[PDB]
Amino acid sequence: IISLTYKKISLRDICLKLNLDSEQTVEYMVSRAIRDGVIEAKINHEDGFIETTELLNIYDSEDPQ
Amino acid sequence: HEKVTIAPLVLLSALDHYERTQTKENKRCVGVILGDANSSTIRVTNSFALPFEEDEKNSDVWFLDHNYIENMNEMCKKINAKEKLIGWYHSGPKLRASDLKINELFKKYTQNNPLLLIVDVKQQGVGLPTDAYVAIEQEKTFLHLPCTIEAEEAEEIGVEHLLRIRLTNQLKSLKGLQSKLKDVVEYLDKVINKELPINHTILGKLQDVFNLNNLQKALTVKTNDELMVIYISNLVRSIIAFDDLIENKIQNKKIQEQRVKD
Amino acid sequence: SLVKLFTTNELMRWPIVQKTYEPVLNEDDLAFGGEANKHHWEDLQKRVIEHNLRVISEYYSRITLLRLNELLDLTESQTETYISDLVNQGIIYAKVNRPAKIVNFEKPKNSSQLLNEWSHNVDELLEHIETIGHLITKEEIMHGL
Amino acid sequence: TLEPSTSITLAERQQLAYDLSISALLGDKIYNFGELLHHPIMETIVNDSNYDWLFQLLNALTVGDFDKFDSLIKVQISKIPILAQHESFLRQKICLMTLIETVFVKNIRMLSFEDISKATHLPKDNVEHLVMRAISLGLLKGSIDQVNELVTISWVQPRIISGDQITKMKDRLVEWNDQVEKLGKKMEAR
Amino acid sequence: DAFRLIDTGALINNLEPRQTTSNTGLLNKANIQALIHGLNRHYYSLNIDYHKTAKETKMLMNLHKEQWQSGLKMYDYEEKEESNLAATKSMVKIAEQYSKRIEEEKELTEEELKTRYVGRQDPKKHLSETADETLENNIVSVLTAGVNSVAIK
Numbered sequence A: 001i002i003s004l005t006y007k008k009i010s011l012r013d014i015c016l017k018l019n020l021d022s023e024q025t026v027e028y029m030v031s032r033a034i035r036d037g038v039i040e041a042k043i044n045h046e047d048g049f050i051e052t053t054e055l056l057n058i059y060d061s062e063d064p065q
Numbered sequence B: 001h002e003k004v005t006i007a008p009l010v011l012l013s014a015l016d017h018y019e020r021t022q023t024k025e026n027k028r029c030v031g032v033i034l035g036d037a038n039s040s041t042i043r044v045t046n047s048f049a050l051p052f053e054e055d056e057k058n059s060d061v062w063f064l065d066h067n068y069i070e071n072m073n074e075m076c077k078k079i080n081a082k083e084k085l086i087g088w089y090h091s092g093p094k095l096r097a098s099d100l101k102i103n104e105l106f107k108k109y110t111q112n113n114p115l116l117l118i119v120d121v122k123q124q125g126v127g128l129p130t131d132a133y134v135a136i137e138q139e140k141t142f143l144h145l146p147c148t149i150e151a152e153e154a155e156e157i158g159v160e161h162l163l164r165i166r167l168t169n170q171l172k173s174l175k176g177l178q179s180k181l182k183d184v185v186e187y188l189d190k191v192i193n194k195e196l197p198i199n200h201t202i203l204g205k206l207q208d209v210f211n212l213n214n215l216q217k218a219l220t221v222k223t224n225d226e227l228m229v230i231y232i233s234n235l236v237r238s239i240i241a242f243d244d245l246i247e248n249k250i251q252n253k254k255i256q257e258q259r260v261k262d
Numbered sequence C: 001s002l003v004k005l006f007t008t009n010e011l012m013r014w015p016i017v018q019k020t021y022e023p024v025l026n027e028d029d030l031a032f033g034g035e036a037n038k039h040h041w042e043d044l045q046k047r048v049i050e051h052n053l054r055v056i057s058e059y060y061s062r063i064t065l066l067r068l069n070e071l072l073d074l075t076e077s078q079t080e081t082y083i084s085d086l087v088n089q090g091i092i093y094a095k096v097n098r099p100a101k102i103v104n105f106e107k108p109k110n111s112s113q114l115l116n117e118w119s120h121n122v123d124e125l126l127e128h129i130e131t132i133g134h135l136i137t138k139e140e141i142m143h144g145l
Numbered sequence D: 001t002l003e004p005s006t007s008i009t010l011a012e013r014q015q016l017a018y019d020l021s022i023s024a025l026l027g028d029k030i031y032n033f034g035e036l037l038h039h040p041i042m043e044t045i046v047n048d049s050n051y052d053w054l055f056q057l058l059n060a061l062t063v064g065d066f067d068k069f070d071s072l073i074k075v076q077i078s079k080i081p082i083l084a085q086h087e088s089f090l091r092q093k094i095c096l097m098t099l100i101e102t103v104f105v106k107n108i109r110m111l112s113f114e115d116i117s118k119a120t121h122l123p124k125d126n127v128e129h130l131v132m133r134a135i136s137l138g139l140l141k142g143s144i145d146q147v148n149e150l151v152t153i154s155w156v157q158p159r160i161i162s163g164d165q166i167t168k169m170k171d172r173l174v175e176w177n178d179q180v181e182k183l184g185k186k187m188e189a190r
Numbered sequence E: 001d002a003f004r005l006i007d008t009g010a011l012i013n014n015l016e017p018r019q020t021t022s023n024t025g026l027l028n029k030a031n032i033q034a035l036i037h038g039l040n041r042h043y044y045s046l047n048i049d050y051h052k053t054a055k056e057t058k059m060l061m062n063l064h065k066e067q068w069q070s071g072l073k074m075y076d077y078e079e080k081e082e083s084n085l086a087a088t089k090s091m092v093k094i095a096e097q098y099s100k101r102i103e104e105e106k107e108l109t110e111e112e113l114k115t116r117y118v119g120r121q122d123p124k125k126h127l128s129e130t131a132d133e134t135l136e137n138n139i140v141s142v143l144t145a146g147v148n149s150v151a152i153k
Helices: A011-018 A023-033 B008-020 B066-076 B097-101 B153-163 B166-191 B203-211 B220-226 B228-261 C002-008 C014-020 C040-059 C065-072 C076-088 C117-134 C136-144 D010-025 D053-063 D066-070 D081-096 D113-120 D124-136 D166-177 D179-189 E054-063 E074-083 E085-103 E122-129 E131-148
Strands: A008-010 A041-044 A049-052 B003-006 B030-036 B041-050 B084-091 B116-119 B130-135 B142-144 C060-064 C102-104 D142-145 D150-153
Touching: A008 A011, A011 A023, A023 A041, B003 B008, B003 B130, B008 B030, B008 B041, B008 B084, B008 B116, B008 B153, B008 E054, B030 B066, B041 B066, B041 B084, B142 C117, B142 C136, B153 E054, B166 B203, B166 C117, B166 C136, B166 D166, B166 D179, B166 E074, B166 E131, B203 C117, B203 D166, B220 B228, B220 C117, B228 E085, B228 E122, B228 E131, C002 C040, C002 D124, C014 C040, C040 C060, C040 C065, C040 C076, C040 D124, C060 C065, C065 C076, C065 C102, C117 C136, C117 E074, D010 D053, D010 D081, D053 D066, D053 D081, D066 D081, D081 D113, D081 D124, D113 D124, D113 D150, D124 D142, D124 D150, D166 D179, E074 E085, E074 E131, E085 E122, E085 E131, E122 E131
Parallel strands: B003 B041, B084 B116, C060 D142
Antiparallel strands: A008 A049, A041 A049, B030 B041, B030 B084, B116 B130, B130 B142, C060 C102, D142 D150
């Protein structure tokens, strides 16, 4: 829910909304969501924000066929 | 250049008199054609054979009588006056000094350039049993004009009554793919390796096809945009395949009605 | 030659040609415009830019705006003035990117891909079978003799 | 190509070849100086007394050195800049035709200003304006890219040379050989 | 139509109804229908049949069967699509409306299990008219995709 709202969101912004533990705890949990291809995003540790890798425009691929 | 259009009546009529004379492979039949050569598209509406005699051991020996040609032209004026002599044909696959030297003989009675024709009796390969060849004075070379087969409304269907979908249409596609393969490999291997003929005049036209997986890999990125129309065709077809379920669901009422009547 | 030069004219020698030879341009009697020299270096310069910029689209597909100012002998503000007049009058069309300073061709998308650009592939496969099929007999004539 | 017509002595063949040489110096049309090699012109003359100008310009296109040919000629043809301008054009026309089929086997159409810079021995600024001059004369059709430093040009004018494209014309048909099986068998099975 | 003189057809001349297809003239309809039985003179018994030899058989198959596709291959596939480029996109869209507009008219008669609009031949009208329309869409879908497919880089 929080990933679809903000494409680029800070690491500490997730812990404020969901009242999580710390930044190292959410860093592990977000990595679990893209395991099966659900969220399809990437985590930038040096930049400090999680960016979504989905540009849509999937019609150019073979998925419609 | 010019174009050639020959009706199917002319092509098969030339093959009939070949067997009627019991002509073997050592002999060949020569004849004349009629039509209108004035326009850019040469049309052949008629053909007549000739008593052609040739020696098999000498290419300089031939028998051609123009008196039969002069009489033939006078006999045609009483049948069809709109037809004039546009050239002459001949049989046999081989081209020897007999058919090459007589090309100027028919030129006296033909206003345009006589159109040479090789009628294949065995019909070996592809289509077009007869090839239309034209000669130039400037060096002489035999060039083939875009010969096509076309007739009138009653003439095209007339042979259909005497002779008498998607997968079949694709069968002819593979035959054209092997035509690209077999024509280039056999010809190119003859120019290279052993026995180089005088060439590089034709090579300029051959490589003119290859420049424009024979075509272009530079559009591969743009091809996906060209493929989009193909993907669009599957958008509606998915419903078209579902449109077959419309009748499939309506036809369910028929059998359900049969169970009620039963 | 000046009329045909507009295709290949880079406007590098433009002030040199007018200065060396000035029959009708800078020094003239009949059909002499301007007070002295001022209207000759303006009206003539405005025309040669229109003729030069017209063929740039047909030659340069993507050109840097910094380089475009050197070919047309203009600046960043002066270049946008002449190109806007040709587009408004329906002469040519191109791309002008102000922050990135990139001038592209901007090929129109009305071709719709397969509906246009693919129709030019007919002569590619039309000259293959039709040509070689005509040269089958010629191959046996040259080698057979 | 005509042996019987235009029957002249041996001394007049060198004078006729001299007019053929100076005529091709001032223009690039109709192939290049190598066109007269296969024709009975360069083979009927002598390799000395300044009759080798046609042979010297054959290898000068690949080497790209104007000083070699300029030292073997006189002041008459060397005082006109057109000789040096159209000579450098034939040097580029060989490279401009490498975008479709010359060297690259994959038929990938690409050209960069760095590759043509080493071939024409010119900097990156001069090669940008030089490509436009070749297209404006009606040689080939295409455009370039200054942003990504790329040159996109097709192939039109044929050449007289052979042996470079012979192997590829068969190699491009090898890709057709592997395509006879999969679609040949599956279509007949339907 | 041929003709054979019967001379005197009154009594005991010869038997025409033997060779092939005789005793025609059912009711008043024979050919143009004005001849009926007597035809021209004493029932000349028109019969005509054709024949083909070995050379004429292979000639017609390589020249004209339905249309002439021989002599050239990939042009008939491309030129049919190229001339129809703007048409195919139009014909798919134009026939798309007329396909449902027929389905939105006659099909509404039969809805519930009972009778409402009293459909009789209406459910069979849109079935037969749109039967080929759904088939033509699948044909042009393979042709448009097939020509651009098959190698050609």
